[PDB]
Amino acid sequence: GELNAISGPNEFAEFYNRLKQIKEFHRKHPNEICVPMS
Amino acid sequence: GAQVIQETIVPKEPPPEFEFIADPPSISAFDLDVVKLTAQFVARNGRQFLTQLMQKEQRNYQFDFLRPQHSLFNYFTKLVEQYTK
């Protein structure tokens, strides 16, 4: 976790970080209903 | 210079007083991104990386698309082939 440093080539680490973003993205919706019309 | 964001909250944040669906039409924006993300990484590191995920998350239905048992597998496998080069 965090941003101290990296331990080496760990794709799994970056994958879980990308996953966190998508999860959180849909977890907290913004203050406005900005959805796509069709 | 017009860059500014307004990020405030309110004490009134009730639950969604709307209905629910049971397996709606087309893939959700969430899963869409998850499949792409996965398909991009597997295409960048090779099948070995993919197979590892298929082991560690075998009991997580969200990774079941990696198996041909899901229709999403078709979309996913076709995406890997496009992300590889």
From Swiss-Prot, chain A:
It comes from the Eukaryota. It is found in: Nucleus speckle; Nucleus. Disulfide bonds: none annotated. Ubiquitous. Belongs to the SF3A3 family. Component of the 17S U2 SnRNP complex, a ribonucleoprotein complex that contains small nuclear RNA (snRNA) U2 and a number of specific proteins. Part of the SF3A subcomplex of the 17S U2 SnRNP complex which is composed of three subunits; SF3A3/SAP61, SF3A2/SAP62 and SF3A1/SAP114. SF3A associates with the splicing factor SF3B and a 12S RNA unit to form the mature 17S U2 small nuclear ribonucleoprotein complex (17S U2 snRNP). Identified in the spliceosome 'E' complex, a precursor of the spliceosome 'A' complex. Identified in the spliceosome 'A' and 'B' complexes. Component of the 17S U2 SnRNP complex of the spliceosome, a large ribonucleoprotein complex that removes introns from transcribed pre-mRNAs. The 17S U2 SnRNP complex (1) directly participates in early spliceosome assembly and (2) mediates recognition of the intron branch site during pre-mRNA splicing by promoting the selection of the pre-mRNA branch-site adenosine, the nucleophile for the first step of splicing. This is Splicing factor 3A subunit 3. It comes from Homo sapiens (Human). The gene is SF3A3. The chain holds residues 71 to 107 of 501 of the full protein.
From Swiss-Prot, chain B:
The record marks L37 as: Critical for binding to SF3A3. It comes from Homo sapiens. This is Splicing factor 3A subunit 1. Ubiquitously expressed. SURP motif 2 mediates direct binding to SF3A3. SURP motif repeats lie at residues 34-76. Component of the 17S U2 SnRNP complex, a ribonucleoprotein complex that contains small nuclear RNA (snRNA) U2 and a number of specific proteins. Part of the SF3A subcomplex of the 17S U2 SnRNP complex which is composed of three subunits; SF3A3/SAP61, SF3A2/SAP62 and SF3A1/SAP114. SF3A associates with the splicing factor SF3B and a 12S RNA unit to form the mature 17S U2 small nuclear ribonucleoprotein complex (17S U2 snRNP). SF3A1 functions as a scaffold that interacts directly with both SF3A2 and SF3A3. Identified in the spliceosome 'E' complex, a precursor of the spliceosome 'A' complex. Component of the 17S U2 SnRNP complex of the spliceosome, a large ribonucleoprotein complex that removes introns from transcribed pre-mRNAs. The 17S U2 SnRNP complex (1) directly participates in early spliceosome assembly and (2) mediates recognition of the intron branch site during pre-mRNA splicing by promoting the selection of the pre-mRNA branch-site adenosine, the nucleophile for the first step of splicing. It is found in: Nucleus; Nucleus speckle.
